[model samples]
Target: GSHMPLPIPSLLIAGIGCRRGCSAEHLRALLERTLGEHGRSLAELDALASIDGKRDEPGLRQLATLLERPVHFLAPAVLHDYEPRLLSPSAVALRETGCSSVAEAAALALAERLGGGRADLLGAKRSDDRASIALARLLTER
Candidate 1:
């Protein structure tokens, strides 16, 4: 979605491909090219500094307030290390857990491996009884 006059422009996933040694002019040119007129706002510049300053939870919270969006953890499980509460999703949550692909494959294999026999063992009390059986077996085996 297009930004809604967010008081300042924001970059989502910008890449800083600077060489080891680059002049301030290089950095300035990069900003001017990517951001255009909004680059001239000193407040925006300050906000950018705060957003990109450090990889701390407090700084991240500040940036999230400015951006008005939930940040997804795609880099690694270390974001969980920074904040363990992150792993536990509320009833409403977005983004992939990287499990759907694996889960589907596992379900297919389980259906082939022990479909009907396991259904009989579990008494097939649920509509998704077959899928539930596979999921339970997978969780226990793992």
Candidate 2:
């Protein structure tokens, strides 16, 4: 495979989590800081993702609008499959949402969606008081 060209992934998903009513500003700050620290950027994200419980979350919608990226809300069952891949699983999250990790799980679930259905974590989950964020990229063509 030495002569093989790199795979150009079609999607990069940013999974996010937050307490109730987190602000768009705080979410953006964390997103920017985390992505920048990891040599990525908001522009690299094709979408934002979260558990279905956050489907109507205002901050998430605002962030997606501001970034001009769509936001996806995955079912808890869908996210559960990615728990083993979580770098920071939380018991609290599992009890509350039926998934052990939100940002990491959601990002991976969405990135791998309709791909060869595999994903790679671009960065581990990050958080401030208001929100959490993680990045994942598609590993193969759909």
Candidate 3:
């Protein structure tokens, strides 16, 4: 006989925007301010972001070095061209399941919905611009 178990979705990872041209310091400030003590090392940060579970900061840093972009707080944008979806009902449920505070619940819910399509979360498409390259590199280092 099989048993049913509670399901917990992974946390979503996102960056402001590559085209928006935000700087590393700006992103670092935002992440540090947002997460505080939870401010993750590059490895942990990538795990929170990558569906493939990558954690190699050195490889990611090398890629960033090649791109000439400082690996500060920002990776690449996951939202890309779509509207934010973590505001949806399923995400809200996920959030409420995990958090007690209203703010925490809302924030986590919002994160759950960012990728919108199931494929995005799964990183199935090779065209996944954000997670495939940057997120993959990030996880390898971590």
Model 2: CA > 4 A from native: 1-6, 140-142
| Better lDDT candidate (1, 2) | 2
Show the colliding residue pairs in model 2: none
Q: lDDT by residue for model 2 over 51-131, one digit each (tens)?
A: 997346988889999998898899999999987889887766778898888999999998888455689887668877667
What overall lDDT goes with each candidate model?
A: 0.25, 0.84, 0.29
For lDDT, the strongest prediction is 2
Encode model 1's per-residue lDDT on 1-142: one tens digit a residue: 5875433122222112122234434434443344332233323322121112124344334433554533222322322222221212222112332222211222223322332222011111111111111111111221
lDDT of 3 by residue, 1-142 (tens): 3676533343434322111233444444444443333443333332222211123344434434543443333111322222242222223322423312212222222344543323232221111112111121112111
Clashes of 1: 0
- What order do candidates take by lDDT, descending? 2, 3, 1
Model 3: weakest 10-residue lDDT segment is: 133-142
Per-prediction TM-score, please?
0.22, 0.87, 0.28
- Which is superior by TM-score, 1 or 2? 2
Q: For residue 108, what is the lDDT in candidate 1?
A: 27
Residue 51 error for model 3, in Å? 18
The candidate maximizing TM-score is: 2
Model 1 alpha-carbon miss at residue 76, Å: 9.7
